Ligand binder design. Structure first.
Ligand code: ZN
Ligand code: ZN
Ligand code: ZN
Length: 178
């Protein structure tokens, strides 16, 4: 197995996947690495299994249909993996914890949002449809773009949103378009 966490790329107290060579810190994995379970399979492995059990799940889908899906176990897992893919980017640090807003010429958003809030929300089964999760994720980046206006720091929002959207289209097999 790898000797660094797949998500944050640091060593430390790592849990090793039994079906692939990836490793994780306990709270870097989503969901948090389970207490017992031997063997243990990581979320990358669990997602690959879904795909292998239903090859047709990779055919293109309309985003509007995906968003209306209820958060049954497989959709819960897919949203956990998509959230994990965003944390895998080091620029996610900017969006992880609760933001605050005091900048001359800007007003803070009406509905602040951040990754760890989404993480808790998923853990607590607060989303009933995929749409709930996707709306909160998109709101993170839209709040950032609106607040930072013409400062070049706005680009961090564009960058991390692009990671989110590419992974969304991949994980949920959204139909490719020009
Ligand atoms: Zn880690
Ligand atoms: Zn694995
Ligand atoms: Zn089948």
């Amino acid at each position: 197995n790898s000797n660094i966490c797949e998500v944050c790329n640091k060593w430390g107290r790592l849990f090793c996947c039994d079906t692939c060579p990836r490793s994780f810190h306990e709270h870097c994995h989503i969901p948090s690495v389970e207490a017992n379970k031997n063997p243990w399979s990581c979320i990358f492995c669990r997602i690959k299994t879904i795909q292998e059990r239903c090859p047709e799940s990779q055919s293109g889908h309309q985003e509007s249909e995906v968003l209306m899906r209820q958060m049954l176990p497989e959709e819960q897992l897919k949203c956990e993996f998509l959230l994990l893919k965003v944390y895998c980017d080091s620029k996610s640090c900017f969006f992880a914890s609760e933001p605050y807003y005091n900048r001359e010429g800007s007003q803070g958003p009406q509905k602040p949002m951040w990754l760890n809030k989404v993480k808790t929300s998923l853990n607590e089964q607060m989303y009933t449809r995929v749409e709930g999760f996707v709306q909160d994720m998109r709101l993170i980046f839209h709040n950032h773009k609106e607040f930072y206006r013409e400062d070049k720091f706005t680009r961090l929002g564009i960058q991390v949103q692009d990671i989110f959207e590419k992974n969304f289209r991949n994980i949920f097999a959204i139909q490719e378009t020009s």
